[PDB]
Design a protein around this ligand. Sequence first.
Ligand SMILES: [Cl-]
Ligand SMILES: [Cl-]
Ligand SMILES: [Cl-]
Ligand SMILES: [Zn+2]
Ligand SMILES: [Zn+2]
Ligand SMILES: [Zn+2]
Ligand SMILES: [Zn+2]
Lengths: 310, 309, 307
Amino acid sequence: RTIKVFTTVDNINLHTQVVDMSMTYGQQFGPTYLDGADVTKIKPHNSHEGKTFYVLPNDDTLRVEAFEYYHTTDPSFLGRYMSALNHTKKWKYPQVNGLTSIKWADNNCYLATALLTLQQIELKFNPPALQDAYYRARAGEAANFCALILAYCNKTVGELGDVRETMSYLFQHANLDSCKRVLNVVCKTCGQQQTTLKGVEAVMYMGTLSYEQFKKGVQIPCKQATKYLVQQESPFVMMSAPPAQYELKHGTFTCASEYTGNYQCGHYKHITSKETLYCIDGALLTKSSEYKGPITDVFYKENSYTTTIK
Amino acid sequence: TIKVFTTVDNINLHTQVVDMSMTYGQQFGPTYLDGADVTKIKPHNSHEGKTFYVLPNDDTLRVEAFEYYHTTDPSFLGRYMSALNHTKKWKYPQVNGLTSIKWADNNCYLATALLTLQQIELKFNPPALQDAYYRARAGEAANFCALILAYCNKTVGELGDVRETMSYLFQHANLDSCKRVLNVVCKTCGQQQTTLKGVEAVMYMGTLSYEQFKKGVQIPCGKQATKYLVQQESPFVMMSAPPAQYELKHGTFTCASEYTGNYQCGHYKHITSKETLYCIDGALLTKSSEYKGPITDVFYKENSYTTTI
Amino acid sequence: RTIKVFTTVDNINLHTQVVDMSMTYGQQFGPTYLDGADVTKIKPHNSHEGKTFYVLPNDDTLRVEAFEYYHTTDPSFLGRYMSALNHTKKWKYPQVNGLTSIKWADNNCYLATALLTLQQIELKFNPPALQDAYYRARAGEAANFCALILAYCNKTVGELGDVRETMSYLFQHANLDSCKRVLNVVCKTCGQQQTTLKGVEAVMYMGTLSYEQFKKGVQIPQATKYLVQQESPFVMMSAPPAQYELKHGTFTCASEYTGNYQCGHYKHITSKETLYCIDGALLTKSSEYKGPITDVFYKENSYTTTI
Ligand SMILES: [Cl-]
Ligand SMILES: [Cl-]
Ligand SMILES: [Cl-]
Ligand SMILES: [Zn+2]
Ligand SMILES: [Zn+2]
Ligand SMILES: [Zn+2]
Ligand SMILES: [Zn+2]
């Protein structure tokens, strides 16, 4: 006695199947999932009739569809995505001041901070899987998008996390090709040193948080040199620096990432500049005319910059 | 070959003659020795006449398992044995009459559950859980903990919630004959009374004070309303609320659950009302005439209540 | 279409292999690793030609080589070592005041504290795998050594840890056989009680941190406990974390512990020309130190009491 169901790797190309009720899913399909739940070792139930089941690439049709949708060969990917998903579908994604956040759960403050930021910067993912989920995230269905993020960064639920690290991995799969930065390092001894970055390395800097400062001058070892921004072409810039007490002034930035705690007691909050300043702490929300605290990331809007130096 | 026992329940022992060359796995599939996964190792000497947990791989063991555990989930044993392998190394000291746990692997929430379960009238429907619950009260609380972790799909080290844990456990408790009746009075939308049975009858999330729950509580309807208790029939009630500063007065409650810390830095302590107030913090024990602190659960003794409203 | 690679369990006995490009590694070898990375499920790539791959003991040659090198029959060992390794190779091991530390990651403060201590106390591992890695640790390549420690102690990455617990498991595999301690407990009621410990139990004590005090007298259920004879290159004095003042050059190194439950942090203090506090990649100096200490290591050759 057999029933009718669907298998897929992308949840777009559905493949029609007739499962033997006695035999388990695993026997027939190998690794098999039902909205994250690993159903490899259980046997086809009745309620399953005409439901969609994620399976592993175990033929050429599914090996293509997978790579086409996910832009990855890693045969562990689905496993960890489905694992991640099984948890993230039980997380709460409340609307907070227009934005999909996450109620705090499983040290996920860094995923929340990522998710709030991604809704406020111009960006387009190269993988369909990521672009699709990024749309349905902004809507309010951000479970999938989170699972994919955890998957793409090889993180697991409960694992501690870094916003800046996560943004980096995600910007690999963003279309940032036409983004461009030009930096110049002036020592009176060793002369000049200019660099021309494209892609991810064009938008991210680790050293200071103030973008205005980054244009004027920044002191570094070669004794000391002067680093400044020559040309920036990108829709945003991310300015990261080791967490330090810093005053955020309204409307001088897009959003920021706060980090209290030191080791495994570390917590990210998200600050966003709107009509006034809002601090998004998962499901909780504060307002002030100005903000002071340990900031580690700051995002700034940009179109085209050129410096008035030499 | 040597003589050993396989079982799924550790009650029906099945006599076996294991080939010394071949590993356990080859002969039995997944095989465990007090939690330790011995699927890949070969029968040793010291094993003679020891009891080994195996997976349901025939109809005798498929029945015994479901009869004892009240679940068909073929991952259950795996996670129970995994859990067990750790919990058998935990310390379970007696603290003011009660089996606690020395702090280990973020287990403060299991400790708090365990201390509570010893102070509220309850009967588990699964034998596995009832059996272990008896041997827990005695002092052998390793198994009971493993089963709790198992039944709640938690793993060791995983952060935990007392209230969430109690809920999952009360699913397998016999609470059928428990009954609650609640009434919500708005001057706009009139009256609204509800008749809950089972788990939903004993647990409430909103406020900690049981006395206040009988008088009145304010909630949204585009207006706010008045919620009060009409009838309660159960041996205890659990009053949960988001952790908040609250004053515990001696002998106005059975036990409580305290929660300090915010994100992954959260700690549960257990407070119990006896001749005075005792705070059980794993293996540590304090006493005061009164207590003030962030409480999130309070348990109250009850037989039968009816309101004069 | 096939390429040439090497399989091994010890990375000393290399076994030459010709892998089918279509089939994955797993199909051909079972569990297969490339510097920790589990490559059981991926197929032989291009870059791999003439690289060394860790495999599981799946014949008697590799079952011997493994036990010879690791001194353990636990058939899970390599799995967890390679798993551990896959993370520890991404950790930073900076030099700090002469010593290989670790930048903080995955609650690893206790591994850092162990590692800093092991560089400052005379010790020899019985497993080759551990001695080999302990040399390459002191040099600066401490990824392997850490993986092996995590492996040998049945810990995983991110798992919370105890310095004293870790030292114990490690001293099992240290050659401490000729180490010896003699303790005497004097009650005016129940008379005298002396004990003769050898091996690991000879160097470790849980009760107080002061070695000088341990020689004079210590009160227990009361009675008086004192050290009669000590023969070992170091002693470890552990006690539940408590405020304690460290005086320069009265000890080798210590272990600090702030925090209570899962918020606990180990720092390492070392006595050199002055006092240095190693907190992973961070470094402090003071003329004196006061803080919650739980372990203190002392240099010793041969002690005998005048009591
Ligand atoms: Cl947040
Ligand atoms: Cl507790
Ligand atoms: Cl350290
Ligand atoms: Zn210069
Ligand atoms: Zn109303
Ligand atoms: Zn913490
Ligand atoms: Zn005595």
